[PDB]
Swiss-Prot record:
The chain crosses the membrane at residues 9-29, 60-80, 87-107, 109-129, 151-171, 178-198, 230-250, 279-299, 316-336, 342-362, 374-394, 408-428. The gene is SLC17A5. InterPro entries: MFS, MFS_dom, MFS_Na/Anion_cotransporter, MFS_trans_sf. Residues 81-86, 130-150, 199-229, 300-315, 363-373 are cytoplasmic. The keyword Membrane applies. GO terms for cellular component: apical plasma membrane; basolateral plasma membrane; cytosol; glutamatergic synapse; lysosomal membrane; lysosome; membrane; plasma membrane. Changing residue 86 to E: In SD; alters intracellular localization, only partially targeted to lysosomes and mainly detected in LAMP1-negative vesicles and in the Golgi apparatus; completely devoid of L-aspartate and L-glutamate transporter activity, but retains appreciable H(+)-coupled sialic acid transporter activity. GO terms for molecular function: carbohydrate:proton symporter activity; D-glucuronate transmembrane transporter activity; sialic acid transmembrane transporter activity; sialic acid:proton symporter activity. Changing residue 6 to C: In SD; frequent variant in Finland; alters intracellular localization, only partially targeted to lysosomes and mainly detected in LAMP1-negative vesicles and in the Golgi apparatus; completely devoid of L-aspartate and L-glutamate transport activity, but retains appreciable H(+)-coupled sialic acid and nitrate transporter activity. It catalyses: N-acetylneuraminate(in) + H(+)(in) = N-acetylneuraminate(out) + H(+)(out); D-glucuronate(out) + H(+)(out) = D-glucuronate(in) + H(+)(in); 2 nitrate(out) + H(+)(out) = 2 nitrate(in) + H(+)(in); L-aspartate(out) = L-aspartate(in). It comes from Homo sapiens (Human). This is Sialin.
Length: 437
C-alpha cells in the first residue's frame, strides 16, 4: 500500500532526488540569460545584468560540480554505513538547496565564488546516493528492492524533466535569479518534511506498524553483517564488485554521450537546436523515468512470481539497458540529416536505459547489503570520471567536425557500452557474498 512506511520513504526519496536534480540542472539553462550572448542545409527581452563569460568559463563553472561530487562518495558511504543515511541524505540535499539560494550573489561576486559554490554543492551532494543505498539496506525487503530503489531513484529523471522547461518559464516570465530562490525554498521545505517523516531504520521509526516492522526485519534477517568492521581487502579483491564498477562506468559513459554530445551533435551537424519546442529536451528523461518505474516493477514481479534468480534478472535488465542504448546510438550516427529520427533515436536510447535502474544500479545491495553505501561510493567514484573526462574526449575527437568523427565517437560509446554489459553479464553475482556476512 502506498501508505506503508517503506513506500512513504520511497516517495519522499523520489521527491528529494527530484529536487536535487532540478537544482543541479537549472544552471545550464539559466546560464544562457546571465552571460552576455555545413552538412545539413541549416534546418534550424530580459532584465538584470549580463556577465561576459566565454565558453571555457561556462564549462569550468558547470563542470566544477563533479570535482566535489567525486570526493565525498566513499566518505559519505562509509559514514552512512556507520551512523545511518537519513541525516546524510537530508543534509546533503539541504546543502545543495541552501547554497543555491546564494547563487545570485555568488555570480555577482565573480567566477571564483561561483566555482567555489558549485564545488561546495558537489561536496555536499556526493553523499546522497551512497546514503540512500545505506538507507535501503535496512528498509527494503530482498524481494522488494527493485520496486523501492526504482521509485526512489526515478526522481532524478523527473527532476530534469521538470527543471528544464519550468526554469526556462521562470526565467522568461520573471528574472533569472528567481529560479534559484524558488528551487532553493522548495528544497528547504522538502528537508523540513524529510527530517520529520523519515527514520533511517524501521526500529527507529515512530509511526511504523508492528507487523510491517516485523516483516521488514525478518526479510532482512539473514543478510545483515555481524562483523561491524568494514572488510576493505575482501571488497577490493571481489570480482562481483568490479563487475558493477565496469558496468556502471560504461553506462555513465554511454549516457554522458547520449545526453551531452548527441544534443551537441544535432546542433553542430543537424543544426536542429535540440529543444526547438522547450519540451523536446525533457521527453528523453520522461521516457527514462517511466521505464525506470516499469522495469523495477517488472523485475520484482519476475523474481517474486516466476521464481527467477536475482542474478538472472540483473543480467537480463542490464543486458537490455546497456545494449539498447548502444544499438540505437550506432544507428543515430547514420541518420544523415533527419532531425526527427535523431530525436526519436535519442528518446529510444534514453528510454531503454531506464531498465538499468533494476540492473547493476541495485546489484550493490544484492552482493553486500550491509555495506551497500560503501559499494555504491566505490562504483560512483569511478563512474563520475566519464562525466568530467568526456568533454576532453569529444573536443579532441572532433577537430574537423564532420559526420565521420561523430560516428567514431558514437562507435566508441557503443563499444564501451557493449564491453561493460558483457563484463557485467559474465562476472556479476546476485547472492550475498561471504565477506558481507
Amino acid at each position: 500500500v502506498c501508505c506503508s512506511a517503506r513506500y512513504n520513504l520511497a516517495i519522499l526519496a523520489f521527491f528529494g532526488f527530484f529536487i536535487v536534480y532540478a537544482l543541479r540542472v537549472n544552471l545550464s539553462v539559466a546560464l544562457v540569460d546571465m552571460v552576455d550572448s555545413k552538412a545539413c542545409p541549416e534546418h534550424s527581452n530580459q532584465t538584470g545584468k549580463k556577465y561576459q563569460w566565454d565558453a571555457e568559463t561556462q564549462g569550468w563553472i558547470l563542470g566544477s560540480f563533479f570535482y566535489g561530487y567525486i570526493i565525498t562518495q566513499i566518505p559519505g558511504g562509509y559514514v552512512a554505513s556507520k551512523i545511518g543515511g537519513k541525516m546524510l541524505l537530508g543534509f546533503g540535499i539541504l546543502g545543495t538547496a541552501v547554497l543555491t539560494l546564494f547563487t545570485p550573489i555568488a555570480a555577482d561576486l565573480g567566477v571564483g565564488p561561483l566555482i567555489v559554490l558549485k564545488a561546495l554543492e558537489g561536496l555536499g551532494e556526493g553523499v546522497t546516493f551512497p546514503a540512500m543505498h545505506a538507507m535501503w539496506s535496512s528498509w527494503a525487503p530482498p524481494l522488494e528492492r527493485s520496486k523501492l530503489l526504482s521509485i526512489s531513484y526515478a526522481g532524478a529523471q523527473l527532476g530534469t524533466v521538470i527543471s528544464l522547461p519550468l526554469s526556462g518559464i521562470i526565467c522568461y516570465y520573471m528574472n533569472w535569479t528567481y529560479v534559484f530562490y524558488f528551487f532553493g525554498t522548495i528544497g528547504i521545505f522538502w528537508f523540513l518534511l524529510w527530517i520529520w517523516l523519515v527514520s533511517d531504520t524501521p526500529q527507529k521509526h515512530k509511526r511504523i506498524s508492528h507487523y510491517e516492522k516485523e516483516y521488514i526485519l525478518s526479510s532482512l534477517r539473514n543478510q545483515l553483517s555481524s562483523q561491524k568492521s568494514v572488510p576493505w581487502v575482501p571488497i577490493l579483491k571481489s570480482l562481483p564488485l568490479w563487475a558493477i564498477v565496469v558496468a556502471h562506468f560504461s553506462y555513465n559513459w554511454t549516457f554522458y554521450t547520449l545526453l551531452t554530445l548527441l544534443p551537441t551533435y544535432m546542433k553542430e551537424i543537424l543544426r536542429f537546436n535540440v529543444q526547438e519546442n522547450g519540451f523536446l529536451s525533457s521527453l528523453p528523461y520522461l521516457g527514462s523515468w517511466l521505464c525506470m518505474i516499469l522495469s523495477g516493477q517488472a523485475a520484482d514481479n519476475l523474481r517474486a512470481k516466476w521464481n527467477f534468480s536475482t542474478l538472472c534478472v540483473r543480467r537480463i535488465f542490464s543486458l537490455i539497458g546497456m545494449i539498447g542504448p548502444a544499438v540505437f546510438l550506432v544507428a543515430a550516427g547514420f541518420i544523415g540529416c533527419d532531425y526527427s529520427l535523431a530525436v526519436a533515436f535519442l528518446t529510444i536510447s534514453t528510454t531503454l536505459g531506464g531498465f538499468c535502474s533494476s540492473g547493476f544500479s541495485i546489484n550493490h545491495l544484492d552482493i553486500a547489503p550491509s555495506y551497500a553505501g560503501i559499494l555504491l561510493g566505490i562504483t560512483n567514484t569511478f563512474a563520475t570520471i566519464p562525466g568530467m573526462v568526456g568533454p576532453v574526449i569529444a573536443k579532441s575527437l572532433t577537430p574537423d567536425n564532420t559526420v565521420g568523427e561523430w560516428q567514431t565517437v558514437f562507435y566508441i560509446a557503443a563499444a564501451i557500452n557493449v564491453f561493460g554489459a558483457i563484463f557485467f553479464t559474465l562476472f556479476a553475482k546476485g547472492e550475498v557474498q561471504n565477506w558481507a556476512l
